[PDB]
Amino acid sequence: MGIWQMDCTHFDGKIILVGIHVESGYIWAQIISQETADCTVKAVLQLLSAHNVTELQTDNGPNFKNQKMEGVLNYMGVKHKFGIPGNPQSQALVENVNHTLKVWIQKFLPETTSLDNALSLAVHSLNKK
């Protein structure tokens, strides 16, 4: 169906952008430098370039809902659905991903050499098959 649901989450002061491909459950995540509109759109545009996205479901905060993001999503032909943080219409799935992801990161932290490596293993655990 091409719907992705995204949010940022925080881990020890680092910012992690997370997406779930709604129809399959596939999880994507990347550490991003700052929680800002510019940094968020840069990371989203490249996800959009790599995957065939028809709709993006986000919260309504200034990092996901702003004129730059609006322009990118309109140029890319992506419908934008949004609502308050944690809302069940556009954020239910990724909220629960974020809770689970960060438990896995905690599990892998002592088993890895960096947060980025712990994140990769956490995402692999969520995607495991």
CATH superfamily: Ribonuclease H-like superfamily/Ribonuclease H
CATH topology: Nucleotidyltransferase, domain 5
Number of domain modules? 1
- For this structure, the quaternary state is monomer
Q: Count the beta strands.
A: 5
- Highest-level CATH class: Alpha Beta
So what's the overall shape?
globular
Listing every helix as H and every strand as E from the N terminus to the C terminus, the arrangement reads: EEEHEHEHH
* CATH architectural label: 2-Layer Sandwich
Helical segment count: 4
Helix content: 40-55%
Rg computed from alpha carbons, rounded to a whole number of angstroms: 14 Å
Category from helices, strands and their pairing: alpha/beta
- Side by side, the strands of the main sheet go 3-2-1-4-5
Terminal CA distance? 21 Å
Largest sheet: 5 strands, mixed
- Tell me what portion of residues adopts beta-strand conformation: 25-35%
PDB class: viral protein
Keywords: alpha beta, Nucleotidyltransferase, viral protein
Assembly: monomeric
Entry title: The 1.1 Angstrom Structure of Catalytic Core Domain of FIV Integrase
Description:
With 129 residues, this protein is of the alpha/beta class. The protein contains four helices and five strands. The chain has helices at residues 37-50, 67-76, 92-108, 115-127; strands spanning 3-11, 14-21, 26-32, 55-59, 79-83. It has a five-stranded mixed sheet, with helices on both faces. The longest helix has 17 residues, at 92-108. The chain starts with a strand and ends with a helix. It comes from Feline immunodeficiency virus (isolate Petaluma). This is Integrase.
